[PDB]
Design a protein around this ligand. Structure first.
Ligand code: HEM
Ligand code: HEM
Lengths: 145, 145
């Protein structure tokens, strides 16, 4: 149930998501690439999914990876903006899942993003509390996969 | 070239884009659905492309349509935010075009969105001058299709 998962986003969780997002969301290009490069470093077994992006080890220098990384941050921007209305949050998460489902990305696969997020947050001085909050948002997406 | 197209975005054009976007982009759910509904109303032939969305005549009530309309607006949010750096605008546009090319959407088909955009702008009192500005942004994407 995606709705039950969204119900886990309590007042405190939503507050922490916004506070952290105010910082990491201000530099979508920088933090977006950092998130992807950390994913490829910690989970090399996922690189096979981004073969269209060429040599992802190039990081910021790869124009295809940079385009994907920036675009990725706008999906998160969308989720944060829908935190007030769970009905809209759910419909945008299901729309989001469509393409990832077509790519055969399973919930187990997607959950691997939690590590990179925790590390990116940490580099910006955000601790456990914030990593946990984001883990709850990702859970909503997983329930839709 | 997508890069050459991005050159049409002069200072005055980028100004009208941001000014108009501050308004139509302030209500993504509302205007986003207006864009889609207007598209289906004036260009019935495009309804076949969105069969996944189910019954698009339901408008706001259709969760799938609402989810798509809100997500669509964040693609435009992305373009607007990259206006000052042609390099970033280009890579995000090419990324964006990937899925639309796989769906067989030609540059001419995509251009059909100009009509709906014009009307949505007009509903907020933004005249031909702004419509033309947006037509140039859409042209950038067309250069990649
Ligand atoms: C917070 C996590 C994530 C976000 C916000 C995110 C966001 C996005 C967005 C916005 C797109 C572009 C639109 C589309 O094609 O659907 C996309 C594409 C893609 N995503 Fe996700 N994604 C995330 C995690 C993942 C993970 C963990 C995988 C795989 C293990 C994955 C694999 C893909 C692939 C392969 C593409 C296509 C890239 C390309 O060819 O350009 N995504 N994702
Ligand atoms: C202002 C122009 C437009 C924007 C910003 C836009 C944005 C988007 C976005 C963000 C997606 C979701 C990610 C993905 O590509 O899978 C999408 C999907 C799609 N777009 Fe575009 N689009 C635009 C115009 C059009 C037009 C004119 C057509 C065709 C007449 C079109 C056909 C499609 C289709 C068929 C989908 C998949 C919908 C589904 O089955 O869920 N788009 N578009």
């Amino acid at each position: 149930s995606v709705y039950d998962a969204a119900a886990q986003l309590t007042a405190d969780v939503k507050k922490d998501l916004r506070d952290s997002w105010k910082v990491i969301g201000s530099d979508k290009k920088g933090n977006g690439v950092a998130l992807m490069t950390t994913l490829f470093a910690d989970n090399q077994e996922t690189i096979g999914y981004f073969k269209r992006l060429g040599n992802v080890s190039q990081g910021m220098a790869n124009d295809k990876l940079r385009g994907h990384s920036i675009t990725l941050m706008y999906a998160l921007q969308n989720f944060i903006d829908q935190l007030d209305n769970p009905d809209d949050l759910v419909c945008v998460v299901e729309k989001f899942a469509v393409n990832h489902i077509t790519r055969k990305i399973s919930a187990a696969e997607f959950g691997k993003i939690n590590g990179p997020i925790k590390k990116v947050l940490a580099s910006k001085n955000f601790g456990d509390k914030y990593a946990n909050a984001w883990a709850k948002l990702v859970a909503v997406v997983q329930a839709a996969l």
